[PDB]
Amino acid sequence: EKAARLQXXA
Amino acid sequence: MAKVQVNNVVVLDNPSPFYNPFQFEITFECIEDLSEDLEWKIIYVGSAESEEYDQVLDSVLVGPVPAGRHMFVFQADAPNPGLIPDADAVGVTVVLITCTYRGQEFIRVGYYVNNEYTETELRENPPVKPDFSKLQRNILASNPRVTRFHINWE
């Protein structure tokens, strides 16, 4: 959940 | 369906020292001739928590693009370490490749990037301030994160 910010990229 | 289809992205010169420029060989197909330009960008995620530390490494306008297959090497200088928060410098970060047509983003390709030291002492006892001249960038090229957004192509 560190990359939850980037959830507009799997 | 979409006028531009990205077929493949190959990560070149990898792994490499932190300061080496990024190199991505992009292949895309154009169904019909495009009236406008395609804007490609490479964005480096300096900090996972804060947007302000994303760095646009390079932006390229390609256009007009005739129908058919297009292949090009997109190269961009390495990020400015003067904008990478110390806590985020060593370990996993993300690099993104984005393309827009008429200002609308239609594809986003992300790669996890692992920045790590190569000397045993540094790996066991990393310096308080990250030493970018001793970091090795390893783009995890075998697993890209892709998102395709359906835009208005007229």
Contact B61, B80 (CB under 8 A): no
Alpha-carbon separation of residue B59 from B32, B40, B99, B110 (angstroms): 23, 6, 10, 16
* Method by which the coordinates were obtained: X-ray
Contact B94, A3 (CB under 8 A): yes
- Interface probe for B, chosen from A1, A2, A6 (most Cβ of B below 10 Å), is A6
As for how many domains chain B has, the answer is: 1
Residues of B near A (Cβ–Cβ under 8 Å) read 45, 48-49, 51, 94, 96, 105, 108, 110, 145-147, 149
DSSP per-residue letters across B18-81: TTSPEEEEEEEEESS--SS-EEEEEEEES-SS-GGGEEEEEEEEE-S--SEEEEEEEEEPPP-G
- Cross-chain CB nearest to A2 (options B48, B96, B147): B48
Dihedral of CA B57/B16/B144/B10: which sign?
A: positive
Largest Cα–Cα distance of chain A, in whole Å? Answer: 15
What contacts A7, CB < 8 A, 6 or more positions away?
none
Contact B116, B140 (CB under 8 A): no
3-class secondary structure, B92: strand
Give the domain extent around B115. Answer: 1-154
A9 contacts B51? CB cut-off 8 A? no
**Edge-to-edge order in the sheet of strand B22-30:** B4-12, B22-30, B68-76
Nearest to B18 by CA among B122, B139, B111: B139
**Resolution of this PDB entry, in A?**
3.0
CA neighbours closer than 13 Å in the CB half-sphere of residue B14 = 18
What contacts B14, CB < 8 A, 6 or more positions away?
B137, B138, B139, B141
State the Cα angle at A10 between A5 and B5, rounded to 5°: 115
Distance CA B4, CA A9 (A): 19
Contact B113, B92 (CB under 8 A): yes
